[PDB]
Amino acid sequence: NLSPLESLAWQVKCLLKYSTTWKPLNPNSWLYHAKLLDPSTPVHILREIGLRLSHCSHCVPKLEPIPEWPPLASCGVPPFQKPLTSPSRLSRDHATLNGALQFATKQLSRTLSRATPIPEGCCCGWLTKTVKETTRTTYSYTDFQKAVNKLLTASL
Amino acid sequence: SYNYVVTAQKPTAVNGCVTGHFTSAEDLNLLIAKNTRLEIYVVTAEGLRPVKEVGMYGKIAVMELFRPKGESKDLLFILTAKYNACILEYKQSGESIDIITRAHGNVQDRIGRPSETGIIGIIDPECRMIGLRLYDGLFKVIPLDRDNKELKAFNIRLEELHVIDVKFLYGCQAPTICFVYQDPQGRHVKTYEVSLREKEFNKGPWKQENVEAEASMVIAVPEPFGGAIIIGQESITYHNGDKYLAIAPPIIKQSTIVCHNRVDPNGSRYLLGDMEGRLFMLLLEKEEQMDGTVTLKDLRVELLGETSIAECLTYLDNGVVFVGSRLGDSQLVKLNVDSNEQGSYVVAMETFTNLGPIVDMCVVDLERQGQGQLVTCSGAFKEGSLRIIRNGKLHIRTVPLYESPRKICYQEVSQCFGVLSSRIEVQGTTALRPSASTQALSSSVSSSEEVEVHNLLIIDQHTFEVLHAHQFLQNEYALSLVSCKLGKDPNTYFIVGTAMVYPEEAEPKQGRIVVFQYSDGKLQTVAEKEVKGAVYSMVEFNGKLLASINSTVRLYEWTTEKELRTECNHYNNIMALYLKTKGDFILVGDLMRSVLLLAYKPMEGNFEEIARDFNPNWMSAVEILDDDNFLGAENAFNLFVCQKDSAATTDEERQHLQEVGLFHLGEFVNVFCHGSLVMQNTPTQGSVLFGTVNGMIGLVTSLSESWYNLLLDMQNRLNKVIKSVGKIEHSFWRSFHTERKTEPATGFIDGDLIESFLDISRPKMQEVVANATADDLIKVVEELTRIH
Amino acid sequence: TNQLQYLLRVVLKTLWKHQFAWPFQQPVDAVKLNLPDYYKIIKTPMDMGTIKKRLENNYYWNAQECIQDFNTMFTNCYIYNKPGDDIVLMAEALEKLFLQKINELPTKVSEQLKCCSGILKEMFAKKHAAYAWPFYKPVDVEALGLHDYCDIIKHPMDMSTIKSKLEAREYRDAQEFGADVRLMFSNCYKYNPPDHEVVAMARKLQDVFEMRFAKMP
Ligand SMILES: COC(=O)C[C@@H]1N=C(c2ccc(-c3ccc(C(=O)NCc4ccc(S(=O)(=O)Nc5ccc(C)c6c(C#N)c[nH]c56)cc4)cc3)cc2)c2c(sc(C)c2C)-n2c(C)nnc21
Ligand SMILES: [Zn+2]
């Protein structure tokens, strides 16, 4: 019994697949590896759309891209390669960050270092109508993200 | 927007030092470079007499000394993290002292990826070339001749990309370089000849050979011994042609080695720093034969004692050794000839005040006279402490804790600080040394390889004695703390957020929110709520407790039954680390999505996501200057001001938070907190004080349009007069700079530059002000300096 | 036996109604589906409908024969396709749901218009709402960006319009209704390329519609 939110996310993903203006974030981006976005359940497409990680170029032509991999200063791991520096020196370097960023950096460095690269008009209006008709006539991207925000807030 | 950023306490961490005949051929100088500061000392039998301190516009990351032929005294080579490079000479004329720039230039290539192990700089002993390694797979050489006053470089391809360390060798007909490179087969040493004619590499004197997996340092021995020593995690080796020697003493197998220096110009004795504070000495025992030649026959390592955790060592004279530090106090030590009552041969002489790495700070007034006082956690591991700072120049008390501090919060109702902390124990676990967590007047525990254990300490304001210490559950890490009064309850509570940890989990799946109370001189639990995640921060919000659990930002209400109840949620973030509040608004800072702004709606009961900033940054700390101006800092050593756009034509343009200001601070910012350090009962408005990893404590205020325009023109006028040391253009130093984009500075007045106008001579002031008078501007400077 | 009955009446019923069931409910018609290499890469094609037929007419001799059939159905989809394909996600979800459930395994014109109204009401049921939803309402030329759809198709149609016409008795006889429905499907066929998944859904719904309408009085 698929949940209502999963069913809606599934329809969103399937319909969006065929839009030539939809530009999803690169599936090899670090987010997919550090387990910050679950790749199994389809719901993550909404979470992306919530954060403007995935966007429609027609509505948003000049969005700054999200970096593929974090700068090594904040994770200490180069792209898909074990670090050169020994663990002890890394640990001594992370002790300078504050209490919270320290834990975040430790988590990221403990996770990414075992990653493996995975070998690889506008439909917004109807999507926004489907979402609102599920939670409750010309729209754009803004009114899509604003609706997905409320759906997530009231669903998860 | 407009702002004004000034330096209050200059940085005090040490990240590079060198010794040589700099100021004169007769004297001996110890040169300590700290971030954007360059300190000069002269050694005497009494001690160190500082002669000159000069600030430079660039993070000094490579410093070296060399004496080219024809010069009566050494010359200084400085390369900053922004790839400004210059060669300096110490020029004295009677009582006046000047630092004159011989040659300067930039060596930044258009494209490339900076190496993991950081910038490396090395010089030929014969002074024919300057080596550098600024990118993977490229070696950047700089011919050393008087002609090359613009520092024209030329590259040379490197066969292997992953270079760990590289050094020059003594005694070769042409310059020779040895290094360690890694490949799938393992780690190997190697050699080349750097031909200055062909501008290319040639095969070197001896062959590549395998080394220990952790081989991570290179030392070049002088004549006659030859060769280089490779310092590893579990063994040490000496390689020179057919000669080969190794030693694996168990003494050093307990901890890693991080720094080294040469004691005897003949290369018999070396000092090796240790991460636990130990200070080993390395002895090379020589041997000779009938041919009259000299060769090595054995290696010995012996332990001398304990010192501050060392980032670099150096020898001056009569056994006086200087130990710089990035995590503690910079010490001068005496190396005696006999063990001193305990097996230690080491004795301290003088200790220097070091503040960084600040990891938290809160502004209070213990005198209750309206006078400011900063209390700052500082240090790491066995050098943790609290530095109470109050205005006089500053007075800096100290309180060792012998364990890592993380957080602090001031609680007036009972007049005691609450401090989190963490020590290090070795797996049953055992303690390594006494620490506040077990030296307190009273102790209790929660009961609802190196492994950390975290404690919450209650510290009295009058005596800073450790009143009590509470130990958190096994494997649990305390992350955030705050003191507040909840709802209608008249009590005052400590609230601490914790996050469980396990090896397999990539995102913590368990945590706790714990409420403590302090009365009758004792600490006890009152309320605890289990949550599904870590807790990166918590805040007092109009009587309600605002927390962030993993990506969600949550709001809790304090019932009359002494429990926390959920009010409303939020889920539009990657990982919410930082929080701040003013009235109703909330300024959530995320891991990578910069600053998010909310507004709590009382008559509806939910958060309204009124804006965002979309540019990707890696935030470190965020703070609010007013209802509509937000300040934030990122590991790129910059500051940027986010402002809710006032004029917007569409709904979309009201979602963007515009980055209306950009400034390259030159320091890793680590925490913000409102407050000030002068008596109160003027151009600038407001105030915010922020710590740094390098110890630099700074102040940020707002400016009215007119003052910003005036100070911008004043700043531009100064750069045409002030002869910056190293000839680095000011705008290039203060430009926003990252991996992605570059931008000129806008919206921030460079405080340290303006104050310098107070030093220039009267003719220089007249030329500065030309097209008004100096005094009508000296008053402006005076009003500005009074804020710190 | 008991396990066969359990599979037929619990697992089969559960998997026959799931929101991801429809694509696997019929043999893989490669010719229509444009699958060139499919019939060389798999030697034993299998589908849920085959399993239901075998269970209902006791084609099996042992219960595990049907379990290996389900596993083969998952395996063919896994082998032919690559990670990241939607069919792969559907297969994974079905596999995990099956594993969850398997653990419990024990040890006369008026007559014609009435018929057409019944058929159209059937097409609206949740029984087919999984894949019949694209046609429930007129295709919006603006809310989906199809600029040319106004030009390429000259007679838009949708199930809601047909239902309204029937409620208004606009259809003098059932032949007009049949022509309208076939036009509704043929427009989708004509506009889209054969690869687009919408066509797959249209073919499914039209198969159901023909199976029902062939029995018109
Ligand atoms: C891009 O806009 C257009 O185009 C024009 C417009 N678009 C739509 C529209 C577009 C797409 C979708 C949609 C709906 C569902 C799915 C879906 O669930 N996708 C999974 C899948 C994948 C392959 C197969 S399979 O059957 O091909 N493959 C296969 C089968 C079986 C087996 C065993 C295997 C196997 C193995 N072993 C390997 N492969 C296999 C079967 C199923 C995908 C897309 C829905 C709607 C649209 C309308 S009105 C309206 C409101 C909308 C949104 N609209 C109509 C009517 N007309 N045009 C349009
Ligand atoms: Zn769009």
Residue numbers in the entry:
A (entry chain B): 45 to 164, 176 to 191, 197 to 216
B (entry chain A): 2 to 393, 709 to 743, 748 to 768, 784 to 1016, 1022 to 1111, 1124 to 1140
C (entry chain C): 60 to 166, 349 to 458
Lines quoted from the article behind this entry:
Targeted protein degradation is a pharmacological modality that is based on the induced proximity of an E3 ubiquitin ligase and a target protein to promote target ubiquitination and proteasomal degradation.
To gain molecular insights into the mechanism underpinning IBG1-induced BRD4 degradation, we solved the structure of the ternary complex formed between BRD4Tandem, IBG1 and DCAF16–DDB1(ΔBPB)–DDA1 by cryo-electron microscopy at a resolution of approximately 3.77 Å. Both bromodomains are simultaneously bound to DCAF16 with a single continuous density representing one molecule of IBG1 located between DCAF16, BD1 and BD2. Thus, both bromodomains are simultaneously engaged and bridged by the opposing ends of a single IBG1 molecule. The ternary complex is further stabilized by intramolecular contacts between the two bromodomains, including the sandwiching of M442 between W81 and P375 in the WPF shelves of BD1 and BD2, respectively.
